[PDB]
Amino acid sequence: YNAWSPAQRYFVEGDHVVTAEASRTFQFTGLDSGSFYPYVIATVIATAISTVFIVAPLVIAPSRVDLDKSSAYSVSFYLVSIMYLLFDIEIAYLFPYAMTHASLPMYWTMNLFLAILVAGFAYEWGMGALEWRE
Amino acid sequence: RLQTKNWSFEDVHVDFPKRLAKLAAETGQVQRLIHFSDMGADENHKSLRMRTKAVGDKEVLDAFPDATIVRPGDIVGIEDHFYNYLIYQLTLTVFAPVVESGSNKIQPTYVLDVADAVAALLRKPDTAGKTLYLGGPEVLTMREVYDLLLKTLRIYRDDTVHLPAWAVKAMYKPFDSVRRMLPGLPMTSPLATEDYVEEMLRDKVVPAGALGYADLGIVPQKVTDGLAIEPVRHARVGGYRWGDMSAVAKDIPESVRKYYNI
Amino acid sequence: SLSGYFSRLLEASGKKSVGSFFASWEFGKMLVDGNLAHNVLVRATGAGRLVGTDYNGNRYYENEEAAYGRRRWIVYKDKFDYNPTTIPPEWHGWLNYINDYNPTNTQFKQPTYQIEASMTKTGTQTCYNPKGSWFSAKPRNWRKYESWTP
Amino acid sequence: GWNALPSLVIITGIWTAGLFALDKVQMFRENKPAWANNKDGWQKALYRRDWYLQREEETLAMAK
Amino acid sequence: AKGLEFVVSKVDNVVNWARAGSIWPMTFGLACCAVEMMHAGASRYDLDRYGIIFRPSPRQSDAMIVAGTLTNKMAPALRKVYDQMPEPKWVVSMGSCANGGGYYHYSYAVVRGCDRVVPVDVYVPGCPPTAEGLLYGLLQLQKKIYRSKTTQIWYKK
Amino acid sequence: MFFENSAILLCALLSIAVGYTKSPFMSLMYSVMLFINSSFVLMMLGFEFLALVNLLVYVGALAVLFLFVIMLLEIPATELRAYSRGWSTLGIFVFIINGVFQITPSMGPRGIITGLPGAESITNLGHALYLYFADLLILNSLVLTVALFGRFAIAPV
Amino acid sequence: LTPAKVNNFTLNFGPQVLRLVLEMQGEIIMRADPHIGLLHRGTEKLLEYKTYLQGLPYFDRLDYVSMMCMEHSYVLAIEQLLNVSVPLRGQYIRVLFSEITRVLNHLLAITCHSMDVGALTPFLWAFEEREKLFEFYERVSGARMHAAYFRVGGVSQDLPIGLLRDVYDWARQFASRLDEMEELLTGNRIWKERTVDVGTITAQMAWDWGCSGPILRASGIDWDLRKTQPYDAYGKMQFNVPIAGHGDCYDRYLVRLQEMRESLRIIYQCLNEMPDGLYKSPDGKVCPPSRSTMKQSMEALIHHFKLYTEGFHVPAGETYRAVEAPKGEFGVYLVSRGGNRPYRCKIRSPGYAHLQMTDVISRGAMLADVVTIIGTLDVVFGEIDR
Amino acid sequence: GTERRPGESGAWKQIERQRYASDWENDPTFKRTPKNLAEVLDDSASMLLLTDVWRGMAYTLGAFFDKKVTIMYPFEKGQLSPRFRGEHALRRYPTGEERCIACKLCEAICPAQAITIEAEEREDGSRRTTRYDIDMTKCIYCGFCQEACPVDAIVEGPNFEFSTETREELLYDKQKLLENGDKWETEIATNLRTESLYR
Amino acid sequence: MIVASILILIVPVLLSVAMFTLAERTVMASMQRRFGPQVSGISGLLQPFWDGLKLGVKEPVLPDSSSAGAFAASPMISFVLSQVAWVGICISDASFQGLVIMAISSLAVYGVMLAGWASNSKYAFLGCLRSVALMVSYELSLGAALLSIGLFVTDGTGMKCLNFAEMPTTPQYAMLPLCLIFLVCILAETKRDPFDLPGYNVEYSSLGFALFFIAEYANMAVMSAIASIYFLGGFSALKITALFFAFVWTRGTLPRYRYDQFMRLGWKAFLPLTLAFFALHASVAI
Numbered sequence A: 001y002n003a004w005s006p007a008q009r010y011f012v013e014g015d016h017v018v019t020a021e022a023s024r025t026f027q028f029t030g031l032d033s034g035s036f037y038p039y040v041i042a043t044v045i046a047t048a049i050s051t052v053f054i055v056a057p058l059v060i061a062p063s064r065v066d067l068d069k070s071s072a073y074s075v076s077f078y079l080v081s082i083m084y085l086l087f088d089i090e091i092a093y094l095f096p097y098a099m100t101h102a103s104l105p106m107y108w109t110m111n112l113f114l115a116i117l118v119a120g121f122a123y124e125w126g127m128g129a130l131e132w133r134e
Numbered sequence B: 001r002l003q004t005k006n007w008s009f010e011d012v013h014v015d016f017p018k019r020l021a022k023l024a025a026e027t028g029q030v031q032r033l034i035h036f037s038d039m040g041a042d043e044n045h046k047s048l049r050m051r052t053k054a055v056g057d058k059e060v061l062d063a064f065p066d067a068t069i070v071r072p073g074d075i076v077g078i079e080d081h082f083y084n085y086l087i088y089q090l091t092l093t094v095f096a097p098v099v100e101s102g103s104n105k106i107q108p109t110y111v112l113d114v115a116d117a118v119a120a121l122l123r124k125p126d127t128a129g130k131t132l133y134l135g136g137p138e139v140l141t142m143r144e145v146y147d148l149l150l151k152t153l154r155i156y157r158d159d160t161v162h163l164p165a166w167a168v169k170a171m172y173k174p175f176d177s178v179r180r181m182l183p184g185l186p187m188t189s190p191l192a193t194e195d196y197v198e199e200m201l202r203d204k205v206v207p208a209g210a211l212g213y214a215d216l217g218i219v220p221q222k223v224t225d226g227l228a229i230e231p232v233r234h235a236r237v238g239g240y241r242w243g244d245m246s247a248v249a250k251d252i253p254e255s256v257r258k259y260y261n262i
Numbered sequence C: 001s002l003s004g005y006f007s008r009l010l011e012a013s014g015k016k017s018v019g020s021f022f023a024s025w026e027f028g029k030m031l032v033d034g035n036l037a038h039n040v041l042v043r044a045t046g047a048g049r050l051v052g053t054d055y056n057g058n059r060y061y062e063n064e065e066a067a068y069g070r071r072r073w074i075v076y077k078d079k080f081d082y083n084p085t086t087i088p089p090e091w092h093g094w095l096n097y098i099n100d101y102n103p104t105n106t107q108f109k110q111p112t113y114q115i116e117a118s119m120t121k122t123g124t125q126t127c128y129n130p131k132g133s134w135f136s137a138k139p140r141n142w143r144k145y146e147s148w149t150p
Numbered sequence D: 001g002w003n004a005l006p007s008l009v010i011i012t013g014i015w016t017a018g019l020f021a022l023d024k025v026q027m028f029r030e031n032k033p034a035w036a037n038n039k040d041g042w043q044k045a046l047y048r049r050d051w052y053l054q055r056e057e058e059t060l061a062m063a064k
Numbered sequence E: 001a002k003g004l005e006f007v008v009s010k011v012d013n014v015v016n017w018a019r020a021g022s023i024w025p026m027t028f029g030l031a032c033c034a035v036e037m038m039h040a041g042a043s044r045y046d047l048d049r050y051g052i053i054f055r056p057s058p059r060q061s062d063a064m065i066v067a068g069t070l071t072n073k074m075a076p077a078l079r080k081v082y083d084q085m086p087e088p089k090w091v092v093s094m095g096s097c098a099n100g101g102g103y104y105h106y107s108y109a110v111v112r113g114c115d116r117v118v119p120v121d122v123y124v125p126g127c128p129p130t131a132e133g134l135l136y137g138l139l140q141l142q143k144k145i146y147r148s149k150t151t152q153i154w155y156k157k
Numbered sequence F: 001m002f003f004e005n006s007a008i009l010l011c012a013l014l015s016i017a018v019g020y021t022k023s024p025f026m027s028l029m030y031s032v033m034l035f036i037n038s039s040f041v042l043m044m045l046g047f048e049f050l051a052l053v054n055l056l057v058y059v060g061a062l063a064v065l066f067l068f069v070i071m072l073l074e075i076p077a078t079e080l081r082a083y084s085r086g087w088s089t090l091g092i093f094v095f096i097i098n099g100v101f102q103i104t105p106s107m108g109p110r111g112i113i114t115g116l117p118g119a120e121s122i123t124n125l126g127h128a129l130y131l132y133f134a135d136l137l138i139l140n141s142l143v144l145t146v147a148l149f150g151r152f153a154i155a156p157v
Numbered sequence G: 001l002t003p004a005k006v007n008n009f010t011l012n013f014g015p016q017v018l019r020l021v022l023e024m025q026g027e028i029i030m031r032a033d034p035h036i037g038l039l040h041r042g043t044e045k046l047l048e049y050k051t052y053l054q055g056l057p058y059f060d061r062l063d064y065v066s067m068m069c070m071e072h073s074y075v076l077a078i079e080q081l082l083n084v085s086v087p088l089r090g091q092y093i094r095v096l097f098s099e100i101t102r103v104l105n106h107l108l109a110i111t112c113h114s115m116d117v118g119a120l121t122p123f124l125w126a127f128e129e130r131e132k133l134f135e136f137y138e139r140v141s142g143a144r145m146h147a148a149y150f151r152v153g154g155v156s157q158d159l160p161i162g163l164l165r166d167v168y169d170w171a172r173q174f175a176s177r178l179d180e181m182e183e184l185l186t187g188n189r190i191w192k193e194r195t196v197d198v199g200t201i202t203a204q205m206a207w208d209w210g211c212s213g214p215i216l217r218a219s220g221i222d223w224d225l226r227k228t229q230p231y232d233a234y235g236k237m238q239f240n241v242p243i244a245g246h247g248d249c250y251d252r253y254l255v256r257l258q259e260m261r262e263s264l265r266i267i268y269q270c271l272n273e274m275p276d277g278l279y280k281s282p283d284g285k286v287c288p289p290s291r292s293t294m295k296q297s298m299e300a301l302i303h304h305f306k307l308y309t310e311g312f313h314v315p316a317g318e319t320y321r322a323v324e325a326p327k328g329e330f331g332v333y334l335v336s337r338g339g340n341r342p343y344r345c346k347i348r349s350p351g352y353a354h355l356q357m358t359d360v361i362s363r364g365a366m367l368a369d370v371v372t373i374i375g376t377l378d379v380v381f382g383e384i385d386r
Numbered sequence H: 001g002t003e004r005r006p007g008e009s010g011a012w013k014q015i016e017r018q019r020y021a022s023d024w025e026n027d028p029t030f031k032r033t034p035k036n037l038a039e040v041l042d043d044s045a046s047m048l049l050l051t052d053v054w055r056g057m058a059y060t061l062g063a064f065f066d067k068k069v070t071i072m073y074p075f076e077k078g079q080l081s082p083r084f085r086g087e088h089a090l091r092r093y094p095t096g097e098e099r100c101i102a103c104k105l106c107e108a109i110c111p112a113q114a115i116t117i118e119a120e121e122r123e124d125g126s127r128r129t130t131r132y133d134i135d136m137t138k139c140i141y142c143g144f145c146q147e148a149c150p151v152d153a154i155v156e157g158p159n160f161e162f163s164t165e166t167r168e169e170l171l172y173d174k175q176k177l178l179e180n181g182d183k184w185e186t187e188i189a190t191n192l193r194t195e196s197l198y199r
Numbered sequence I: 001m002i003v004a005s006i007l008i009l010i011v012p013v014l015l016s017v018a019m020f021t022l023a024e025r026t027v028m029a030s031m032q033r034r035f036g037p038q039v040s041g042i043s044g045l046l047q048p049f050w051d052g053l054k055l056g057v058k059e060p061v062l063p064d065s066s067s068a069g070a071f072a073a074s075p076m077i078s079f080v081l082s083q084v085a086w087v088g089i090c091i092s093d094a095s096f097q098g099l100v101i102m103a104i105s106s107l108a109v110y111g112v113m114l115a116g117w118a119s120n121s122k123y124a125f126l127g128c129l130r131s132v133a134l135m136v137s138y139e140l141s142l143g144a145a146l147l148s149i150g151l152f153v154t155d156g157t158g159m160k161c162l163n164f165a166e167m168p169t170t171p172q173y174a175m176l177p178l179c180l181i182f183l184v185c186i187l188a189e190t191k192r193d194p195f196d197l198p199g200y201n202v203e204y205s206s207l208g209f210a211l212f213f214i215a216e217y218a219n220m221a222v223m224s225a226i227a228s229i230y231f232l233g234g235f236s237a238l239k240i241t242a243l244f245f246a247f248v249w250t251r252g253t254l255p256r257y258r259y260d261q262f263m264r265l266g267w268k269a270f271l272p273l274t275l276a277f278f279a280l281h282a283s284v285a286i
Ligand code: SF4
Pocket: E031, E032, E033, E034, E067, E068, E069, E094, E095, E096, E097, E098, E102, E103, E126, E127, E128, E129, G061, G064
């Protein structure tokens, strides 16, 4: 990203600053704190590396054609995956509460959330839904 | 099939067979000298490999009177140099060039027929000192072969293009003027050469009155279909669920077609 | 003891100087063969003594303080193509823990027809082949009769 | 285990060299040994104001 | 030109070094000789010391060691797995049952030697061969791999 | 801002591609990519936490169940008229009218808006969730319980 | 009479030498159909073209994990029809080496079962003692596995001097090796949860399913051939019988361990009671004479000539004898016509019977337990497929 | 320990049985119920905090600092005995004459049928072989040939490292067997000087 | 600059993963009274290098009856995820950096699933699902453990975040059961004992197999760094090596569990314990 208004550049006028931002160096301490930017470049580099390692044995290995070489030598999953869905949503709900200096009524409401959660979870427990015989 | 900085067409196709025939005649105990060439070999061809092949055949004949010359056409097989490169050109590539109209006529043949032919040639004495041409029971053009291949691969997108020969040469010109001073590279089709273009401008079938499989009492099996077509079908594994094709509804089981109501 | 360690290293490697050793191609191959390097640097350099030397130049060492099955070990002179086939039989029994007899303490009886030990020739064209093989000097037709010639 | 000990030391040394090199490189890049610190919009505003002020100083540096 | 040839020779040396020292075989627990094979990888002999790892798939398998007798009913499956081996590949024949049939050589259902189905690079004799003998045979396989010169051939092609 | 705008445009491209293809696996892969890129572009709006929430939930939980259901329920039926029966023209024509030219856009009379980065406060978010919309939080708890109980009661046995 | 119709579920468990086809309605096994014969070498027909001494090495490679036990049954079957008494010292040696062989079979079986379960250390650890006992075998017969030591009327050679010293030295620490072996699995919750209550078998089914060896003992069944139908010097030996009552994989594991303990006890008792005397039966017309005797006597030379070419002629008849094999009860049925070759030699293998229990036992189980079933079954296809 | 517990059973029939029937209590092999706070804490320490993995872990860790039995082949070998049966070989007499007299006892006794013998009287009147071949790819190394021979002609030598790159190299003839005997005679004679007290 | 930093992080990761598998082999040998890899180079200090080069020169085989694109990309995707996780470990400043890495680790489940659907192997079809379900189940408990950790992570400004540099430089003595359960969950995440029942890459080959193992051991190292930062009070090479030593120690001493058994264990013993501990920490931290 490059700034497009002097207000975004804190009302600092001139052409030097525009070009400076255009070809700036990435710096967490510069203009891009908490940028997440290296993730994308890491993705590009890893894509390149993995593609190269895929390609290379197709170059430095002899090949022979065989017919037989080209051949290979439940609801419990439903239960687990759907429970994971719901419980991960609940964990996402819980996460902001752990990131704040919550108060006592906030604590009690959080406990109410957890109480409903564990009520459903324990009902599933007591009915044999957590026994993975099937 | 391609020239190299360490080996030229003449070196492989003329001098070595000539010296081999000379040493064979020097041995005195050799009874049969079997040499191989192409059906498209002719001394008046623009293709350098075909011309070298014909010259080497003539040299072998002069050196060894009783050597038997075999000139088969396109030979098909699991690891052949005919269908495999055609697959590498139809697939794994953006577009497939085709020389001119591509209506030139060729007579592809099967390798096991060639092996039984060698056995019969060793069995028959009269074939010594002669030339035998090998070809299939059918005559087809490059366009027809490409269409049947696309049917075999069931590809719904014709990626082949009919182009003038000079355009194809200019496409292959830069990599053919650098063919020398190079130790050779892998994954190079023999098709990207001007000699191939010259091959595609002439018919390559058995000459009228030539000695063929019938002279050996041999019936050439079908190359378009049969057991020789199973290996190329394993590119499409024979076809269970591959591709999007619907025209294949001919061979689909009964109840499935009433399920899809055609 | 560093001086004793280097003395043992010189007397085992067969060279004349540490500079002659570290600069030799045998050391370089020791940088890629871990078993050979282990021989040269660890097992031969420990507590123990030399026993004797065969006509192939290989050296034999024994260490009574070691545990059973690991008391005896040999250094091949051929540093690049070491092979067990070159060990003479009169050392084979003591090496294989079959007998406690070696040339340095046992005087065996040498037959006049005794053939010495050497490297195997397997994988080469000079190796043995049966008399009906194509590599044989004169091919044999094992027909048990004589064909009549006019 | 005397045979695995060389590998044990090598792993630690490899990670040590890599971390030291990354430390030096990122210190050269960011020019303060605290860039990994948590930052809110307030600290972000201060940092961006400071960067634009340095750029403004350079702009006014080439005027005398 | 001489320097390029020297580089080719050194590269061939390195290629042989890598391929010989990291041979991964596949396990065919056929018969008797497998027990010697199992003890060969054990603590006393330590096949793993020589860069040897047994893989569950032919796809990572570098060479095949035949440890046990081969039947006619088993020959198609053995050819199946060998034909699943990728290149470059090798075959090691251990045991007289694998060698030429041996003590079942006149049986009606025994393939007289695994040679009749697949090529073999190393023939290890013994009924059973010693695990030490298997070590020696695999070292000889390494020696055969050492003499290989592929890029030397390719540069002169 | 070429690449940011390209990523923004990629979202609707993937959205159309999701319905375009006939392989269910391809549709799910397209949806996963769309979810990831959507979260990444929303990250340009300054929502670090919400992007991770969306990523976690939809990729790890929902798309996994999608692929599982398809893999347990879908023999390839692509040729089963999925290519031989085609697609309804009225649907694509209506979709063009609705989304290419957008005769009824969200903004309506407005034709230009300014997009500005935000400042996500997990502290303010928590304050709102547990002080201003706590009742809705408990209602969401009840909805989660509804989902769990209904699922476990609709079990196919 | 039967169509295919519903294809639905289809499975293929291993061409690599057991071939298994199973049937699940999901995660739980309902049917399991093993297919065998990939190691069927047709030895029984091959036996007919060999002399009794010629065919002896065939019995080495029937159970290449336990060899001398395989030799012993065939030798006893020959001798009983031959009416030959075995000398005391030979019986002592046979029993002692049989106990060592049983120890080897138990060690390899338990280690392979562990590796299939997932424990790799006991495998490597116990193979060291296995190498020790292989050295013992080589010292006495020159072969690590296929000794061919047992002979009709005794053994090929007497024990070399200094062997019992190392045998006792090995026994002095084999108990410690076993103890350190147990602590890796015995007190583990994971090993039990993998093994407890998996493949439960009853006494009634086991006797219906023809079980033998340790599997029988784990069902509350008091049975040892060495105590009910003793052979050679096993009657003199005093040792205990481990007994379990669940028919569990953990139970079979413990039963095999206690069997190893009892084998060590018998080894000690044999070591401290070794007698001095003849090791071969004094009948030269069946037993080969000494080489020194052969080279200085016409009669022994003639008998060496005849036995080593034609062999002794068993009188016409029939008998079946079995031996308490480490994998169960190993028996051989011998049919005699009167000549120097056995007319018909049928071989009975306990693992073949145990392998028949897979379908009924694997019902209600999981794919993680099929390997458990095979490992606890302790089956060698060499005896299963002959 | 070998005791059992409810929930640690690896099945469903047994687990469903024990959680709905107290049958395991009647079994003495099941660890009995804790009766006080101390026993409850002991059970909790047994289940939680591992305390079962810990012992095997410690024993393996002690094995880490322990010695090894690994040998450095080919620079070290194993232990073997004179009775070892290895490569078949042909022996001579100290004057130099072949011990084998073609009595064909070895071929008769061999159950492997791997021995092919042809022989006739030599020009001096001696009874010597004309063809002596043993198929090592077919030989089972049983040593029964060494047992049958009454002149100590055929012996399985202490050579066991004789693997070849081709199968044809193992088709041993008379000449190669005699070469092997001349090579390994001293070791074989030394072993016989020991084995004579037993053979 | 950023690219160079990425590569400078990459190199020790690959070299050390090679060394990790080598040392795991060798320590397993040491605990098994053997020596392990010792011939292949000085004391066997060259084994993983030749193994990688060998699998590089080995022929890659592609089934003709499936979609080979997914077959290629699945190990590629796993390797990409490993590299991204490492970058987020060392080259990141995100406020929810731990949550970022957790969400990243959630993504690695697909590679096993992609491979499982890709090849036409029935037991791959089953084992991929089994491993997927195991890691998915344990992910909730891992997130709960991070939730518990986040209850005390505060910077100087007073904002609660997940920044690594602001984690206390002291061990958390007050969450030892939480630490133990997190370590066992980490053990489960890497298909290691006692959760090595699921392999999924059976029909794979060559550098694809190499990349699968690279991703596995890289994820193991990532989780090790996470654990060291969270409970051991800092990020250092010594702690990484110690955790790997302990993991090899556990692998070489224990057998594996059954499928439904570790399912029951995770769903009835681990997640509820983490929930109760999270509630207790939230209550006390108020
Ligand atoms: S060669 Fe001998 S020991 Fe090896 S498998 Fe065959 S019969 Fe068994």
